[PDB]
Design a protein around this ligand. Structure first.
Ligand SMILES: [Ca+2]
Lengths: 550, 224, 89
């Protein structure tokens, strides 16, 4: 009862409302209660582990040792859990689930000694998962890739990879073989080594791909050249769809800039209406980005995970500003208002293109630091605003006559303050200018120096691993997207909308294997674990403290 | 070629200006041979690589700002070089250094953006660059010392108005039918035997000190 | 027979990252300062293309150890007789 999990279980069980009739007041403890607190601790995406009965000699569960591992790991029992992990069934899921539970639990602990041990245990389990997987990678790679995309039946019908993603398992995802798997998804049906410039050139010409211009793997497509299948397989790769969307977005910007510069009229033009059509196509693509439900989840939680995204926020702010500006252009009486509103929209789109540089090798790490330093430069700039307001009211009060003008003296002094901030009268003028020089040219620059030293000192070198962890979801979002550039994405939207009118992930990221296959795979796994454990304990016998004890 | 065209003289002349600028950076080459300056030149050659890709981002930002300001604060105009070049000069004056609410909004947007955040990008990127260099730079310079001495050792002795006197003799000697013997020489066989025997003597004198001081690590003592 | 046997065996034992085997057969080598530097060059040129996160670290630290061996022999031969030791380079 000293632990945090007991208090959380008691707070649930006391608030359990559906137990009306019994001899006592405190009803019972059922397994669906601890399943319910486990689901809220673990995340929304899994199913409930234990089912609620809709109602013998020995009733058994689906897998026993899972349950005992959960019990021993919620209570921070270290050396007990280290024993019973060794008999586990499917280990790579198990170590990551027990890392996720500990990281989600150690935040709410609020005791200065429990949190450190409860964190270091999760780091040790990350080490155990890496240690098993690096064996299974070295034995046979192409079978070891099948281990990540498996859906585990034990841990509530999820996969290993998503579990490692949600736990911020930083050192795990930066392993070599899993990054190779991500790249092999990224380069799609074709081979991974033909560079980017050749990809652009085969993007340029249709029959250059029909020529001996590019590579292929799975040589039935490379040797037997069936050019319709080769074109379909070339367009299925997500790098191709990425470059196509970049080109279409670029042309969208250029023609929008041309219609905004000189071709603006109160009557709608035709180059205007085409651009409004392409932006409608973009908003329907963002609509299907929000509405897609592969597995059933919280629809409000779906909206929350949507709006937690940075670029989703920028994209929806841009589209709401656009429809407000189109409303203002539909008013002929506010044309020069409405027109310049569509200017500001344009500015937002520019930052969207900075999104491109996340995919680079060398630029993304720098973008991370910008996303870091926004958070404190905001609250600095507020202080700057209060300072310049104080200076402006002081200068307006000391050096004018008594005036209450509408926009003559107030806007004149505001322009003078903008000229000052962007870059006998003797003693008073010297006092004013020296006060300005000592204040606004000195100390807040030193605040910025200190705050950004404290910011950039903190980043260190973790940034490469942060980028490698950040790599995945982009590949996910482009893998799920249909292949057309957005003027033609309506052709994709119509077929999917009429198929979901009448009555599922792709099978390259989550697949339910054959039962007969999964038995052989798990037996191979449970073979490799015992080969890991001997090297683990043997090199643990070589620490010097062990030698002194012996 | 452009000066040989009399019809593009003021083009061609100013082309020969830009040539001149290149030659100036050539003279910075001199300071590699110093004791104390070369180490600083190494860091410049380092930070060029990321300041390039930063400056591209700066270019896209100032282009967005310029098109926004040209669209909000002009009449509907398609001039050739009057309004576009005038606004380009206004943007150069801004980047090198009722109308009330809209003017305050424009100037405060400029002050919050182009005077703040990319400077912090530069501070962070160049902190991450200059933090990395550490002190290895002296060894990098000492390693960099060699090839200059090589290139000048191979070069003939004349200053380049008289290097044609060197080029003629070498070109007519290679017309009819080998390093210098101070950097690579095939020794006498009888000499090389004695040299290698001296070497293979000295190796065994190294090895005893190596393993003996390897016997003094504490883990070895605990094992013993 | 080849021109020099122990060179070939050193190459074979050093391309496969066999550490303690190569450390033995270096001790019988013929001309050592060339040998340690060649085996450093091969390891640095090889450890780039390895693409395994555990092989590359050991394959690099071995090259650093061989740099240490070359320095350790040459600093003896310099201290014994300098003007002959310049002829070695
Ligand atoms: Ca989106």
């Amino acid at each position: 009862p000293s632990c945090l999990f007991h208090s959380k279980l008691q707070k649930v069980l006391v608030e359990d409302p559906e137990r009306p009739a019994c001899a006592p007041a405190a009803p019972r403890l059922q397994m669906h209660h601890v399943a319910q607190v486990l689901r809220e601790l673990l995340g929304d995406f899994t199913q409930p582990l234990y089912p609620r009965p809709r109602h013998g000699h020995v009733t058994f569960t689906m897998d026993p040792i899972r349950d005992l591992l959960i019990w021993a790991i919620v209570q921070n029992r270290r050396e007990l859990a280290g024993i019973i992990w060794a008999q586990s069934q499917d280990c790579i899921a198990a170590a990551l689930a027990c890392s996720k539970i500990l990281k989600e639990l150690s935040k709410e602990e609020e005791d200065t000694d429990s949190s450190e041990e409860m964190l270091a245990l999760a780091e040790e389990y990350e080490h155990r998962a890496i240690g098993v997987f690096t064996e299974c990678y070295r034995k046979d790679e192409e079978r070891a890739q099948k281990l990540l995309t498996r859906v585990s039946e034990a841990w509530g019908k999820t996969t290993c990879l998503q579990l490692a993603l949600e736990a911020k398992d930083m050192k795990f995802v930066s392993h070599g073989g899993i990054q190779a798997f991500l790249t092999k998804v990224w380069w799609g049906q074709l081979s991974v080594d033909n560079g980017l410039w050749r990809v652009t050139l085969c993007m340029l010409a249709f029959p250059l791909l029909l020529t001996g211009l590019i590579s292929f793997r799975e040589k039935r497509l490379q040797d037997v050249g069936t050019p319709a299948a080769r074109a379909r397989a070339f367009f299925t790769a997500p790098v191709v769809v990425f470059h196509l969307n970049i080109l279409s977005y670029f042309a969208f910007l250029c023609l929008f800039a041309y219609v905004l510069m000189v071709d603006f009229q109160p009557v709608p033009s035709w180059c205007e209406c085409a651009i409004y059509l392409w932006l409608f196509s973009l908003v329907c693509e963002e609509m299907r980005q929000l509405f897609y439900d592969p597995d059933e989840c919280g629809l409000m939680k779906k909206a929350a995970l949507y709006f937690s995204d940075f670029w989703n926020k920028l994209d929806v702010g841009a589209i709401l500003l656009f429809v407000a500006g189109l409303t203002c252009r539909l008013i002929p009486a506010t044309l020069y208002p409405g027109r310049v509103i569509l200017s500001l929209d344009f500015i937002l789109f520019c930052l969207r293109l900075m999104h491109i540089f996340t995919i680079s090798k060398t630029l993304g790490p720098k973008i991370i630091i910008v996303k870091r330093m926004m958070k404190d430069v905001f609250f600095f700039l507020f202080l700057l605003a209060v300072w310049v307001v104080s200076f402006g009211v002081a200068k307006q009060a000391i050096l004018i006559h008594n005036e209450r003008r509408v926009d003559w003296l107030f806007r004149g002094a505001v322009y003078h303050s903008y000229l000052t901030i962007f870059g006998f009268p003797e003693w008073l003028t010297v006092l004013l200018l020296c006060l300005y020089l000592l204040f606004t040219n000195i100390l807040l620059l030193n605040l910025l120096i200190a705050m950004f030293n404290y910011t950039f000192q903190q980043v260190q070198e973790h940034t490469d691993q942060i980028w490698k962890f950040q790599r995945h979801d982009l590949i996910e979002e482009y893998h799920g997207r249909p292949a057309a550039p957005p003027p033609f994405i309506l052709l994709s939207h119509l077929q999917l909308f009429i198929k979901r009118v009448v009555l599922k992930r792709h099978k390259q990221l989550k697949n339910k294997l054959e039962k007969n296959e999964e038995a052989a795979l798990l037996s191979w796994e449970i073979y490799l674990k015992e080969n890991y454990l001997q090297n683990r304990q043997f090199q643990q016998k070589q620490r010097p403290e062990q030698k002194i004890e012996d």
